[model samples]
Target: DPEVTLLLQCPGGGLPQEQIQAELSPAHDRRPLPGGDEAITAIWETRLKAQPWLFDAPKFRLHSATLAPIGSRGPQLLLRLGLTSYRDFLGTNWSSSAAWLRQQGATDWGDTQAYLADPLGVGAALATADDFLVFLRRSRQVAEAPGLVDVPGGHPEPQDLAGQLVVHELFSSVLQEICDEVNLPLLTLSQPLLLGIARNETSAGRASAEFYVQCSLTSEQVRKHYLSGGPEAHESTGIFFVETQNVRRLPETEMWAELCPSAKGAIILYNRVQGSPTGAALGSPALLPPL
Candidate 1:
């Protein structure tokens, strides 16, 4: 959570596939990108060996990608991992909640220290406009971090890429995720601005890309359309619109404490862009450097 200096790199324009591939070379086989079969067996072998009861679900990741500040809009990164890595890392990280820690009869961080060591990644869309931002309280049925408050986005999947050429059409994934999870049509949304990448490591054994984006939607409008009998009811309980004028009020509320690490970081960056003092005090986000 504290600002730590990481080796930061910048790609001039769009996402950098070649650099990502090379940086991830050592464990490329350990965590392949979307729509691949290479090394999946061994990856799962290690996962199942560690946690036998884990479910065999397919998901996407940027397990070996980095962020690049293209321009004023901020930075972007690519996801390059499968569901196995997420289950073994982020999933294990979430299971160690404060309540879970109590359930396990543990009172120390050591209980979840092993999980904290494994870094994970996630992409988030912070839909906002003039006076407010739209936030979602995740539904209980979701696989990870259910019942938690977060933005309208998720992990990038193979489907997000057109042909897996390494373009990192991250917006494609961001739009799809928001539309699917919020049940709002694409046409209703506006072009989003890249807010920057935040290194989120809130839970015991988890971390993420924390890719934040600002959308052209008012908090009230987002709630009116998405909450009143919306289609994606399964994705979240409902939408929460926090007025920009009252951004400071958030830290005083119980919901702030309930926010996942990435969500907190995303909101902090959002306030910064909006010129809120709270955001300024938090400092800037951490950058993912391409090795």
Candidate 2:
């Protein structure tokens, strides 16, 4: 069940308008960081926090298989950047600093660089970096089959799974398999919903796709459902819910990392699930930001 949510917000708006404005002429667009631009930046923070383990150290890794959406022009990737409250030895004052930046003629990326360049005694960049590391531990999932592993994925198949997304049958079937292998009770959760479709081409003619869906279950609920039995009884190694920080640490995680270029924009998905303020009716597509 993927009902769990990990959201972050920069303690204060990171952009400083006043300082940035000082750099530009009066007629320039003095809005802080472009709303969309800042949103994307935040997603990188989200990915860092979501899979910290993968990036905890300095070894760069790439996914064995591509996960970014490809375009006629090039490959398009998905990434999640997160923004959240951070307290340093000094204090929380990014909002004030952002306002000050607005006054200083620094309106965009150039301005951001400037703000960092001219740090006031009241605010230092070091303060921001000190508390940025987060530890998010996730459980692990291993694949085991009794017979030839029916690689349950590839170009969209009518009955079987495609990729991250699953059809009605495949969705139920996988859930059943998980339940049977883990010896867990059949959950009263809602029917399997299609998250999204991802296309992958192994070769010119050999291509496959995956559909992603959120099962809407909390980490606690999943663990409670499948906490028993040894490896023999379960086809999978059980459930693993990891934070972004942990994902960055392990080599395997980098392999599965979504091919989004900027972590800042990854988690801005389209679905409004369990935690949505308005628990709207089902059958609605989750809202992903426009590219």
Candidate 3:
């Protein structure tokens, strides 16, 4: 363990062991936002220092994505992930949790380190990360809207293990990107919630990661606020809410999964919300064990 001690004391030794092992055995090192509104401000100010261009480009900023593990019945549990996605249907844009999934088999190659390992080589792969899902609203009804479009969520670059494991950094990055694309107010938006997360390492090479939360105000509130910002400030071509139910009917391309993580999360979450443990609920007739 002398090497460990030396590494710890080295000028560039890195974060202390206690901090490194905070989650997922320290090797993962994913942490949630500092846990307060002040923390949000701190993150935002720090970002503004880096990206001054944000003042002009405003988009839908995503803070964090979490999921709740399956349970018998109780408050919703939350599992947090480092990545989140949003869709802008009108601009023919789409995005989802898949960007975070990972792939195995293939060695790190061109953008390989950026892309999670994958045997499929299907381009983008998602990997599961640590999460904490919490109980959110219990309402059975959710509103539905259609014909909305803007842009799919994601950046052009890929993140490495160290880069991907940093949740606060990811959250901050999403918020900035969303703001740049949509004319949304980061400061005024309600605090984010870590709804729940799901992971699958078997599919492709990634364990899908996902998080969910409800925007404080309705879609109307968003539009009105943007309109007030002025014509130029309103970059989005249009807005429309998609009923979670109607999402299925949309075209495959219309629902961009160009990445595996997005696809896996979609499947995982579909089973979760449908109240079925798996795509083929045992005994419902869909799940017939393979011979």
Candidate 4:
């Protein structure tokens, strides 16, 4: 629960790419960050100075999520969302006072992220044809978890006031993120399966959708592609691979020290949804292996 919590999971094979859906509206019920403009802007100002490339960008804000049962699909993951921005994410969720804001929001507004940006992010558990999972060593100059090991991911920019068009983009963005990070060709990948959403406990429970995607390349080929550099090559400095068989043991091992909360949550979600059969219960202590 500390690193992440599984809010809701899809049926047997997880949710199909075409079945995941979303809708959004303005968040009129929310309030300004605790001290309003002065308190909030100060955080971003400091962050902006530390990272000069930082820019306030538009993002799809996650208001809530639910599983809807209807005539069309057995069960669909419906995300009820709104719009927010990178500036607020820094001023709130990514702020040093994130926990305090979350507490204050619940006490006053009755919603945890009501006073925070809570921009939705998407991550990929990209598996190679060789049955390995890819991990990226983030650049130290990056915001959030610099130098930490992370899964390839980014925010779902509004590219959404377009409605359903945006929901599909939300899903597509993760795939795009993978290609950018791993330097893989988009044509070499499969449509992603929703691995469920992951919340980063380090950032006042900041959340992101984790997706499972299989690439046609081998781990070796992926390494070559990564070295070749693509559009987002600067985001990370190196690429690492873990045998799918050994991934479930990471959190219990010292190696977990290298991963950020987002990656930790993404790994956990992947293991729970597809990696193993023994870790049946979310609270189970051990995720032992089988041949």
What TM-scores do the predictions have? 0.56, 0.27, 0.33, 0.86
The parts of candidate 3 lying over 4 Å away from their true place are 1-152, 156-165, 187-210, 227-236, 245-291
Give the Cα-based TM-score of candidate 2 against the true structure: 0.27
Error of 4 at 198 (Å): 1.0
Looking at model 4, residue 115 earns an lDDT score of: 83
Best by lDDT: 4
Instruction: List the candidate 1 regions with Cα displacement exceeding 4 Å.
Output: 1-125, 128-130, 140-146, 159-169, 199-205, 211-217, 228-232, 273-291
Question: Model 4: per-residue lDDT, tens digit, 202-274?
Answer: 7777778888899999999999989987545647888889999788788877779888987887888888788
lDDT for each residue of candidate 3 in 89-150, tens digit (9 for 90 to 100):
11111112223321211232222112222111110111111111111111223221122222
Alpha-carbon lDDT of model 1: 0.49
Per-residue CA lDDT of model 1 for 28-107, tens digit only, reads 22222223433345565776888898775333333344554455343255444432345444333444442353234233
Candidate 4 wrongly placed segments (more than 4 Å): 28-30, 45-53, 69-75, 230-232, 278-291
Q: Evaluated with TM-score, which candidate comes out highest?
A: 4
Worst 10 residues of 1 by lDDT: 4-13
What order do candidates take by TM-score, descending? Answer: 4, 1, 3, 2
Better of 1 and 3 by lDDT: 1
Quote the RMSD, in angstroms, for model 2.
21.4
